[PDB]
Design a protein around this ligand. Structure first.
Ligand code: CDL
Lengths: 73, 119, 61, 75, 74, 59, 269, 75
């Protein structure tokens, strides 16, 4: 009863929306060919780059910034 | 991640720590212990941990998950598969963030620049 | 002659596709089980359908 | 590889050769036992025991053969 | 060999079979090298959420009691 | 007769049957897994002969 | 106040599933008989644990079952070198005192763990952050000195090394970012607009044919005549592509008394 | 290797030939022991010992073959 309120924070919603965007993003990923080259996922690179470009800034010194509550593994 | 069927064992052994585990290749002998008939292509047996995965499927198709899958040839395949992907996940991470731990890495014992020798 | 199906290729032009079919057809080695055939093989008869490992109904049930 | 398996099962058939010689050897053994009994029937029990004993030695080769067969068939 | 299930899925082993010759089979392994660097990067962009959500802070002074488990010696 | 009357016919066939990988490929073809072969795959046996110490040209 | 039951009890609905892994007739027949009388049999042992009663594991005849340990080539010799190969036998042979000792952890995995810093050192860190976000960094000198003094030195070394590791991992993650966000020559000038409206299923076997001849019935109606004609066409195209061939390079590993380069191995010997 | 291994295992099957002749030699030996026993039972124990004794000379070739068999099977 003391810590129930923490589930009302908007960061919980932000976390779920990121998980769904990754689901819809990876669902759209597809193999384009079978030439056994990296171009077989030519269009999928653009899809994932849009996802990364949507939560980072590529034109920075460190697009992935460290914070103690982040991801390393 | 390993992007091949074969890997050098020494590349996954430690240089400054005791070596108590190896990263062995798939145990092809366990494939001959399945009593039933099955189709397996030789092109899929070398890639890491996939053979134990296909064997588990073959055993879960012939048998189920209750009172018939519980035979030594089928449980060892499921245990090997589950253990292979756990060890490979840890070795892969250790290779990504701790490459200096393994033999063959130029950072395990760095060679100095000529400017550090005083000549 | 080449047969069409639901599984299509990955080529934009028709020449690259025909070049792929000619490459695969040039590598076919027919093995017939009937005598009096220029391509006859009692043993070592190649199958013409590829096997695919899938979870059965007993698996998913 | 595949042929190695084929010759293995082929060898497994070869084990039927002692099975053949064991049959002839048994008939010969009992053939002599019959004439032997007629010569001195007073010791039928002694001759009889020796008859089966020899036959036991024959089945030894038999079990020895199939054993080798099943081994080479799986080893 | 990390990202096992991801790599096996990209190679198509869930629906088809690899070519039986090493030349093309090996090129197909090196073809996913870009995608692994991408999917790994995406997995490192997750936003934070309160740690005090499904886990009480173990550094709280309330837990300095260092209490033991009382048992019955049957 | 042409096979028996030859000198290398026995070798080209023996070195092929002795290469465990090439026989593994054939075992896959018999099961239904086959595809096209590159120039490098076609010489898989020539590489095997060279390793043994044979003098083979045209790799 | 009924005892609690685990999820596995609702799969089997009994505490006495006589599971024996030994696939011999004598064993499975006795288990079926024992599995039926477990309700009124005093010699009954549980294999499904509960809140009120512990349970036994899987049975192997009269003994107990455990999977074969995952193959591990590490071993230790006593009398003579055995050259132990974990892939040469199905089940691992027992370790004889005069022959071999196996590596530790028959059933073990590789994990990463961390020591828990001392409680008083943790309280000094909490007080520093708290005074930091409240009063700012410039007014936390007393709280910083308490850390360097109360925290034992082995902890300060860990704290010092954690920063260097995460600094290393931070770079290793950004290098992957750079390789991932790099635009290749086959995607120059292409954006999300040039992407196709396709999903994962469109690259599978049903929609995208694999690179094998017998994946479907495409080449099942081909005759030897059509093949001979195709062999003539591929050779025609080779009259223009075979004109070029890479030149032979020098062998970097010519000297055997030199550390060779781990160059990519040839496909075939 | 695999090609020669195929004929290796095949040769190992050949070792089952003495297993056959050893059985026949046994059936014949005990036959002579029985008929000979009837003609002069006074020396039963003597004949009996020589019988099994002779048999020992039979399994000699048997074990010799199997030994030679596994040898070439791996040498
Ligand atoms: C100690 C003394 C006592 C011992 C005595 C006996 C010793 C026995 C052991 C054997 C000795 C070595 C000989 C082994 C020969 C190999 C046979 C074999 O594997 O079959 C494959 C063989 C070829 O398969 P295929 O279907 O043609 O392949 C077509 C594919 O398109 C092919 O295309 P692919 O892309 O799929 O390629 C597959 C790959 C697969 O690769 C492999 O699997 C390797 C195969 C192993 C051999 C490879 C090395 C061969 C090197 C050449 C030198 C041969 C020397 C032989 C020396 C003989 C010793 C005296 O390559 C091959 O195809 C290999 C071709 C194999 C050719 C074998 C050589 C032909 C011998 C020519 C003489 C024929 C004499 C016949 C007389 C019969 C009398 C009853 O099958 C046959 O030959 C069929 C039989 C012949 C047709 C007539 C029907 C005869 C039926 C006879 C029934 C009775 C059987 C015996 C009864 C005995 C008891 C009474």
């Amino acid at each position: 009863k003391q810590n129930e309120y923490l589930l009302e924070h908007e960061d919980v919603k932000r976390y779920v929306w990121w998980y769904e965007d990754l689901k819809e993003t990876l669902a759209r990923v597809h193999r384009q060919a079978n030439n056994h080259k990296a171009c077989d996922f030519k269009d999928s690179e653009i899809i994932l780059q849009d996802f990364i470009r949507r939560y980072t800034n590529p034109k920075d010194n460190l697009p992935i910034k460290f914070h103690p509550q982040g991801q390393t593994f | 991640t390993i992007f091949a069927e074969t890997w050098e064992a020494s590349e996954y052994q430690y240089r400054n720590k005791a070596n108590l585990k190896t990263l062995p290749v798939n145990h092809l002998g366990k494939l001959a212990e399945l009593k039933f008939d099955f189709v397996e292509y030789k092109a899929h047996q070398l890639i890491a941990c996939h053979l134990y995965e296909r064997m588990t499927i073959h055993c879960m198709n012939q048998y189920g998950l209750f009172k018939d899958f519980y035979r030594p040839e089928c449980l060892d395949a499921q245990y090997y598969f589950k253990t292979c992907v756990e060890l490979n996940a840890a070795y892969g991470i250790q290779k990504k963030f701790f490459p200096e731990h393994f033999v063959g890495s130029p950072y395990a014992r760095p060679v100095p620049q000529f400017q550090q020798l005083g000549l | 002659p080449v047969k069409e199906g639901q599984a299509k290729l990955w080529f934009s032009t028709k020449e690259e596709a025909d070049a792929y079919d000619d490459k695969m057809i040039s590598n076919i080695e027919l093995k017939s089980q009937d005598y009096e055939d220029e391509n006859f093989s009692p043993v070592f008869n190649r199958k013409t359908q590829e096997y695919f490992l899938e979870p059965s109904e007993k698996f998913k049930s | 590889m595949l042929l190695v398996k084929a010759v293995k099962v082929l060898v497994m058939g070869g084990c039927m050769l002692p099975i053949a010689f064991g049959a002839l050897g048994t008939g010969v053994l009992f053939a002599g036992f019959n004439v032997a009994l007629s010569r001195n029937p007073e010791e039928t029990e002694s001759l009889f025991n020796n008859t089966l004993m020899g036959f036991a030695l024959i089945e030894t080769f038999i079990f020895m053969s199939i054993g080798l067969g099943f081994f080479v068939l799986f080893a | 060999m990390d990202n096992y299930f991801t790599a096996i899925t990209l190679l198509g082993l869930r629906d088809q079979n690899l070519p039986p010759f090493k030349d093309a089979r090996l090129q197909r392994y090196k073809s996913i090298k870009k995608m692994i660097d991408l999917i790994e990067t995406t997995t490192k962009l997750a936003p934070p959420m309160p740690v005090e959500l499904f886990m009480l802070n173990p550094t709280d002074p309330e837990w300095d009691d260092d209490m033991t488990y009382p048992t019955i010696t049957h | 007769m042409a096979f028996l009357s030859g000198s290398a016919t026995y070798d080209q066939l023996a070195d092929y049957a002795s290469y465990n990988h090439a026989m593994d490929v054939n075992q896959d073809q018999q099961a239904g897994l086959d595809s096209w072969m590159s120039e490098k795959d076609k010489n898989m046996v020539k590489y095997y002969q060279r390793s043994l110490g044979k003098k083979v040209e045209g790799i | 106040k009924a005892p609690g039951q685990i999820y596995a009890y609702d799969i089997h609905n009994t505490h006495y599933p006589y599971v024996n892994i030994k696939q011999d007739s004598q064993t499975q027949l006795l288990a079926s008989f024992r599995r039926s009388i477990a309700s009124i049999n005093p010699f009954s042992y549980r294999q499904v644990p509960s809140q009120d009663r512990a349970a036994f594991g899987l049975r192997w005849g009269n003994a107990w079952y455990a999977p074969n340990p995952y193959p591990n080539g590490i071993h230790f010799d006593r009398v003579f070198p055995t050259h132990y190969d974990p892939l040469a036998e199905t089940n691992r042979t027992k370790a004889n005192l005069q022959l071999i000792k196996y590596a530790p952890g028959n059933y073990s995995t590789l994990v990463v763990t961390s020591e828990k810093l001392p409680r008083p050192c943790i309280r000094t860190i909490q007080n520093y952050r708290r005074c930091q976000m409240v009063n700012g960094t410039e007014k936390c000198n007393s709280e910083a000195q308490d850390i360097l003094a109360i925290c034992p030195n082995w902890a300060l070394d860990h704290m010092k090394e954690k920063v260097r590791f995460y600094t290393k991992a931070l770079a290793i993650n950004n290098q992957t970012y750079i390789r991932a966000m790099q635009v290749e020559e086959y995607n120059q000038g292409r954006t999300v607009a040039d992407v196709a409206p396709k999903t994962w299923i469109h690259g599978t076997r049903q929609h995208l044919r694999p690179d094998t001849m017998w994946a479907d019935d495409r080449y099942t109606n081909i005759t030897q005549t059509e093949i001979n004609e195709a062999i003539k066409r591929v050779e025609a195209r080779k009259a223009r592509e075979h004109e070029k061939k890479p030149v032979e390079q020098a062998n970097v590993n010519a000297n055997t008394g030199e550390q060779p380069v781990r160059v990519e191995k040839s496909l075939y010997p």
